[PDB]
Amino acid sequence: EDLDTDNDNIPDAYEKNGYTIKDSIAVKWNDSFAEQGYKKYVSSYLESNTAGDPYTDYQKASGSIDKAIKLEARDPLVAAYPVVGVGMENLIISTNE
Amino acid sequence: EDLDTDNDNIPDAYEKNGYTIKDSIAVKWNDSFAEQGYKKYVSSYL
Amino acid sequence: EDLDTDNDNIPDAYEKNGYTIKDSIAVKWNDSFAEQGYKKYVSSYL
Amino acid sequence: LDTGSQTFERRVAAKEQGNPEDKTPEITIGEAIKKAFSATKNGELLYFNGIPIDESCVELIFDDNTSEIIKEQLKYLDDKKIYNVKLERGMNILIKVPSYFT
Amino acid sequence: LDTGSQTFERRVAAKEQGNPEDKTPEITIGEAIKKAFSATKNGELLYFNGI
Amino acid sequence: QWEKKEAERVEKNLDTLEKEALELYKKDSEQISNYSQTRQYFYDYQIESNPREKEYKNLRNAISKNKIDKPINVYYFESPEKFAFNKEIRTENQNEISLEKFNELKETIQDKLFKQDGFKDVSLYEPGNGDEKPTPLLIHLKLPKNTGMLPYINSNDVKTLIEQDYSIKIDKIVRIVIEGKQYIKAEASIVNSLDFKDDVSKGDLWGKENYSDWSNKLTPNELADVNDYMRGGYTAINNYLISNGPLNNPNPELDSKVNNIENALKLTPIPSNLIVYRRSGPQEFGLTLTSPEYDFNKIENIDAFKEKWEGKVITYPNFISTSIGSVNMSAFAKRKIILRINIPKDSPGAYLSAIPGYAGEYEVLLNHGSKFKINKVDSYKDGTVTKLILDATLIN
Numbered sequence A: 001e002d003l004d005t006d007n008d009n010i011p012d013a014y015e016k017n018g019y020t021i022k023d024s025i026a027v028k029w030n031d032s033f034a035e036q037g038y039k040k041y042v043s044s045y046l047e048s049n050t051a052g053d054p055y056t057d058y059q060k061a062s063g064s065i066d067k068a069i070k071l072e073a074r075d076p077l078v079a080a081y082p083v084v085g086v087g088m089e090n091l092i093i094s095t096n097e
Numbered sequence B, C: 001e002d003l004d005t006d007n008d009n010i011p012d013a014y015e016k017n018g019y020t021i022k023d024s025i026a027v028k029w030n031d032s033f034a035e036q037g038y039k040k041y042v043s044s045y046l
Numbered sequence D: 001l002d003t004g005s006q007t008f009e010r011r012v013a014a015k016e017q018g019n020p021e022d023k024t025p026e027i028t029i030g031e032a033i034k035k036a037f038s039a040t041k042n043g044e045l046l047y048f049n050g051i052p053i054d055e056s057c058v059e060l061i062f063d064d065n066t067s068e069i070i071k072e073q074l075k076y077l078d079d080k081k082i083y084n085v086k087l088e089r090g091m092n093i094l095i096k097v098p099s100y101f102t
Numbered sequence E: 001l002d003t004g005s006q007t008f009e010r011r012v013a014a015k016e017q018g019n020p021e022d023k024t025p026e027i028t029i030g031e032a033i034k035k036a037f038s039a040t041k042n043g044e045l046l047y048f049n050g051i
Numbered sequence F: 001q002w003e004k005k006e007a008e009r010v011e012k013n014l015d016t017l018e019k020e021a022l023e024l025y026k027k028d029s030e031q032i033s034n035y036s037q038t039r040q041y042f043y044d045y046q047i048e049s050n051p052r053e054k055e056y057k058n059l060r061n062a063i064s065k066n067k068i069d070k071p072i073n074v075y076y077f078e079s080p081e082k083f084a085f086n087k088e089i090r091t092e093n094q095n096e097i098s099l100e101k102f103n104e105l106k107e108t109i110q111d112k113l114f115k116q117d118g119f120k121d122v123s124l125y126e127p128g129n130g131d132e133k134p135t136p137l138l139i140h141l142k143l144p145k146n147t148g149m150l151p152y153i154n155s156n157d158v159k160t161l162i163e164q165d166y167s168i169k170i171d172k173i174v175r176i177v178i179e180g181k182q183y184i185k186a187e188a189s190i191v192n193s194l195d196f197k198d199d200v201s202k203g204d205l206w207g208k209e210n211y212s213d214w215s216n217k218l219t220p221n222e223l224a225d226v227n228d229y230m231r232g233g234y235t236a237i238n239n240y241l242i243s244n245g246p247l248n249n250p251n252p253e254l255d256s257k258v259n260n261i262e263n264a265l266k267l268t269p270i271p272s273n274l275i276v277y278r279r280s281g282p283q284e285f286g287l288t289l290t291s292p293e294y295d296f297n298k299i300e301n302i303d304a305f306k307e308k309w310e311g312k313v314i315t316y317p318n319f320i321s322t323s324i325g326s327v328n329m330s331a332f333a334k335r336k337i338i339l340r341i342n343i344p345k346d347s348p349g350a351y352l353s354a355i356p357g358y359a360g361e362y363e364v365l366l367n368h369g370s371k372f373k374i375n376k377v378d379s380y381k382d383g384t385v386t387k388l389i390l391d392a393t394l395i396n
């Protein structure tokens, strides 16, 4: 049916049963176009940001986010999330005598 | 039919088949005016 | 006629053929008032 | 995913245990590993860039509470594969790809 | 493009392979080089400034 | 950055009562908006007694206190029944628009001239993410040279308050995708004109000017004809023509005098696009002073009248007496219908009020058998009665 509780442009039934994005709108999933390349998405129909990141379920699912983001994070269940660390390579010591 | 999905003033059919700009409006490409100086542009309609 | 493609308060027919400004409105250039001191301007209508 | 030459850290959303209002969809650990690394599957195999990361061909490592959950839930389940338990919150999995393996 | 004394770096948009909702028009390397360096074509020959 | 600075700067060089009207706008946006849309349809004492007139004209002068220097592109949402599309494009919890509704809308919004009215807030950029989008129809308008725009702040954002004395002209509609919903982007224009909603002094001044010498460039024969027309000629000509005389009943002298007062009108047609008003009872649409249809007080009878006339062709074989002042009079007080005609250029007709000795005050008249395309219909309540404004266009 068509009622949108979290107001993120994916209906509740589609969110709880499975959907995909075609021409930048959500459409009810059908097993026939898994061969055409489409992936099945599922989300929380009571949350806009299911994964907790700054992008809604529709923004992640439809790819309409930063294009440098991995295609992994185009799933509303996987969070777009950077893991940054630092590594030291050598140390210099200036003895001010 | 004229519908602009990405909303950037170029319809989907022009954008996926070829267009050009004349007086700042996108027009359907005709192979005639390739020797008047115009160029054929294609891009993503989404 | 009077259409303004680039929206700069000068019609397209005046920009390509020559115009002048009189009382803060652009008027079509007539060659008779070059002796009053006016000057003939031309521009891109796009 | 500790390939040995690299490392890829992921975060997959999991449902809160008690709350009846947490409508997050449940998935197994294997589906989570497939989604988080966009691995492409081949029958029962699960291929990363070129590397198999299916349960038989890796070396999983958990913390104490994750190992407790998974051991607890392997018994009350059938088909005792770790890729069939389903991803509670706070789990910590580390997939080590083996150096030599035939 | 490295003409020996100058250098001209370009970026041309290419289509993502697996995505069916990627509609970026597909072109060849010749069309890409021609579009990216404003090169003039006369049949079999593609010309830069005079190169 | 720019709009924030200029807006916060205009909110200082405003007069104290102007800022009063602007801040009491942030409270009665709907109420003062509707009152600006329908203020001019009363009596004069009913006008200067209304407590909203102070803030109304204070806000109007605040707006017109800063006119732009070059055309601007603005964007704002609109409901479909603002353009006589009395169905739904799609409910705002749906995501798609059917080709059928697209074709219906295109069929009904392509060939009219929708007059606008009152104040309205607009934006200078298309809607994005976070903006409120309650209606499927997005109007992209072009505001021309010298149109008052007032930038104000609701404590986080900027709105452009403008006043609408123009008439929008739809050019093309396209179906757009925004955030996974399907809206309609319609490109609009303006076709300016003149109207004298309440300040009828400019009305009679300008009419006096542009038709005074119309009395003395023609033969005095049809002049004496219209002189008899003054005091009881027109009533007999109405008694004759509206019954479709010349086709089934040749009235020799009255048909001759009709031709004589018709060729007395195209000397110099209406010299501008104007918005002339007409007061009419339940007769001009074929009913009676107390018909069951007349009880417009329940909006279902309104809907019935809408389906009856909205989007049709009306013709008047009589000579049409109309007024250039929306202020209501007494001699035709309770006539619950108002034809707000937009008389265009090249319109054969004169200012019948220039002649001294005619009871028609601010009264104009045009050719017989003229056409009238009812472009829209709306209601407004005087006391407990719901009078009916009808916005049509004369195309003869």
Ligand SMILES: [Ca+2]
Residues within 6 Å of the ligand: A004, A005, A006, A007, A008, A009, A010, A011, A012, A015, A045
């Ligand atoms: Ca939803």
Ligand SMILES: [Ca+2]
Residues within 6 Å of the ligand: A006, A008, A010, A015, A043, A044, A045, A046, A047, A048, A049, A050, A057
């Ligand atoms: Ca959701």
Ligand SMILES: [Ca+2]
Residues within 6 Å of the ligand: B004, B005, B006, B007, B008, B009, B010, B011, B012, B015, B044, B045
């Ligand atoms: Ca487009």
Ligand SMILES: [Ca+2]
Residues within 6 Å of the ligand: C003, C004, C005, C006, C007, C008, C009, C010, C011, C012, C015, C044, C045, C046
């Ligand atoms: Ca211009």
